Design a protein around this ligand. Sequence first.
Ligand SMILES: [Zn+2]
Ligand SMILES: [Zn+2]
Lengths: 91, 114, 50, 99, 69
Amino acid sequence: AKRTKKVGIVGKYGTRYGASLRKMVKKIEISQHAKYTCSFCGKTKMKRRAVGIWHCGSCMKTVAGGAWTYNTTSAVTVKSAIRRLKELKDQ
Amino acid sequence: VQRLTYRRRLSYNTASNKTRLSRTPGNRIVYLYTKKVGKAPKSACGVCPGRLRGVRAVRPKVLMRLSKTKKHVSRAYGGSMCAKCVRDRIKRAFLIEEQKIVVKVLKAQAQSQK
Amino acid sequence: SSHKTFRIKRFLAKKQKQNRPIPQWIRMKTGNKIRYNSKRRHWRRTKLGL
Amino acid sequence: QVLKFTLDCTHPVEDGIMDAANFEQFLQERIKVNGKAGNLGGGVVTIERSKSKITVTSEVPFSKRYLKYLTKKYLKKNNLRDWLRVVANSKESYELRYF
Amino acid sequence: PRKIEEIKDFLLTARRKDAKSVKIKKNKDNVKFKVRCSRYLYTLVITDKEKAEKLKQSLPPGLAVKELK
RNA sequence: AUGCCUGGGCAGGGCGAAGCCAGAGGAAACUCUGGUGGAGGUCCGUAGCGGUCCUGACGUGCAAAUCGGUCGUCCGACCUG
RNA sequence: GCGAUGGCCUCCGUUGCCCUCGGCCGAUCGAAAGGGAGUCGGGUUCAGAUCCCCGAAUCCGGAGUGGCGGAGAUGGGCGCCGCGAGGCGUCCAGUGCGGUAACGCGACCGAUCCCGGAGAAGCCGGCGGGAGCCCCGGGGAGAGUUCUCUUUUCUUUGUGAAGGGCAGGGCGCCCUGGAAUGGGUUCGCCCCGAGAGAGGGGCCCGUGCCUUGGAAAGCGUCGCGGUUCCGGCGGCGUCCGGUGAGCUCUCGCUGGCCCUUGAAAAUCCGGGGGAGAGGGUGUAAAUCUCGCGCCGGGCCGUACCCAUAUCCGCAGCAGGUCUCCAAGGUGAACAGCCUCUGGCAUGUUGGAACAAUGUAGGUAAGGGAAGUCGGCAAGCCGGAUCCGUAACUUCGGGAUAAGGAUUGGCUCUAAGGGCUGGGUCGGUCGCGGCCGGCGCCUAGCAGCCGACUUAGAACUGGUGCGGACCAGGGGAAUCCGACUGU
Ligand SMILES: [Zn+2]
Ligand SMILES: [Zn+2]
């Protein structure tokens, strides 16, 4: 809040595009541009290369994830369900 | 100030029409058409961003004129793969072969027990 | 155009050679009804629309 | 370092156009060292006369074309820049020649 | 062109069958001998003057050793 | 007029978003101050693109639609071979 | 493997048959701006010259007999002779070598097959390196002014492609070592126990400096041979330094943006393998050929205009038509104005007067929109610095809101920086080098250089100072359309 009160990243859009639309965009704009922690090296190098594809600067590992987030809640849920079904089937 | 023109008929400034300034013994600045900057071969691993060392970065058709020693390095996978990934491949191959031998021994022991 | 093809250059050469005027001794023939070339082409007008 | 520059005028005075003594006096008056025209900047530059050849010897760095500029100014003052011209006959040397 | 550091190598180069006119240029302490061949013009730079004078007499076959001036 | 391929081009300035640094306050949450940063289908504005107004000039004209001043835009839904 | 001819039917080539092996992916066309190996310097014509002449190179293809040298290369053991160097007979190995490593050395066998790389990549911002140009302090050469001054102002003051070496950049390359008291570091970023700082190395570009080319040639000057033709002859110079958010080009790092991810193929190269070849102890098969030597590269365009006269508009039409090079001053600026190199005669005519109407510019006492449908037109404000800035709001804006002060000239002051230098004393060797305890500037001082700014002070001009040029008129509201765009 040093410079802007409640816009931050969406301050580049200025007065345009509507306050509610900018507020809705802000979450995605922060999430896609935020660098995550790579769970291969432990470094904060996971950067969104393109839509749904993330790249590690150090590991050079490319992971197919969400469009704006590294891991989506739907992906986590489906992974857990698939693991549970695999364990149930194999016993 | 001496203003200079193109010495060819390609007036458009394109990739093939790049020039540089050069001073002649006649004491007049002229244009010399420079060749494109070649890049050294990249590692076949596909993981290391850096390019291979010990090899000249020149055009592929100039690689034909270049001698054999300039186009590679004296090593296994020399001039085609980086030393780091080469040694990683060596140790990975050794460890996988040892693990396969161990698995085969365990399977034989299980067959003998059964 | 300085980048002409062989056929175009030959056509231009023939049209250049055809542009010369009539020899004077032509009019001295007995059955001569010709006074001037009447087919001369100047480069400025009648642009030879190739 | 010793800088010796000659301003030899072999035959503008033989014809009786200019005077070597007057030229030497003009040079001694007008030679400027470190922004000081008078006194030749102390005992630094010296002028020798040979009734045809004027020799300027200096110890501090000294421009050779300064002598040419002074000679041209003297000729203009004496109205001689019409049939006379200063030519670098050789290094460290100058000569007055006709057209 | 190629510069030669050895007088013996220069003599071997000049003794070639394809070798031709070998010119001598006195360059005021930078005297040089330039021998023309099929592919390269081989140059030899001699600092000494008496050494160059002696080498002037080392041409075997009576070549085109005519100097440059 | 539109879609595609392959090339070229777009002075100088204003606003100073994310991110980062230092100082101060706090018990914490964190908050203020001074800087760094140069994002924007951002603003003034040249080249370029287009043509609002004077319903100006001309209107058997320079021209079967041109010229002057004033104009909108000029990093992107841009201009163009 | 079989059959045949040809040529010293030795040896090789050729075609015919048989066995064997074999993915491609659609014939073909499609870019004189995409990819695409390899030529530069000087001279030269009335008109062409990276093409002609001279001088230096380079690429591709051929090279059977292979034209040469060099790499596979001339090792060890055993038994003898010989004082010795050395020589003979026999067993062999020998498709190279070095460095811990990154990798290097002029070569350094290799097929069908397979993998990979180059070709082959968006836009924008920042920084750094190099070059071209500009700037300054000087040396020279030629020169304008000199009624007064001006060590004067104006022009010039260099080296090609191709190789060798070295500066200078970059590395996500290696080795010793393991770090919190966290450290290193940029304009910003960023990096580190998945190995940071500190040392020693390695690789890529080296378009830059020295060198062959190459001073022979070119240029600036001074002087001659020649009635004339004459691409001549000669003396000298082509030098030493510092700079800058300076303009352009190029290279290299680093980032930001995409519900945009920013081309294919020809061609070339590297790597995994050993199917196969070699002579057998002085030779050979191979040289992704190491240094040379020989021959050839065929066909087409090459002039000029490329635009207020060589193109299209009925024309020498104020229209339209895609690019490269981009000097000095003022100035934020590739704005406008003035000037240098270069270009020209004012744009299908000239002379004489300056009537009325006009077209394009201006100026007007007092009022200031009372004219007119309507402030149409014109005018006002305009740059920069310092203060100040409301209603509303989507809190981002409005905003250069509105409204105030300064701006010239000259003379000073203060602030914002780089490089070098103390290892001085004694001993010793040839001012320079080595060793020992000292001073350890650890509050830094001394010398030398350099680009611009910011603020303040006084004095002064007829209150004039963004003095030409460039260059926002604002405020209160209503209706419509979110906006940008078309
Ligand atoms: Zn990782
Ligand atoms: Zn790798």
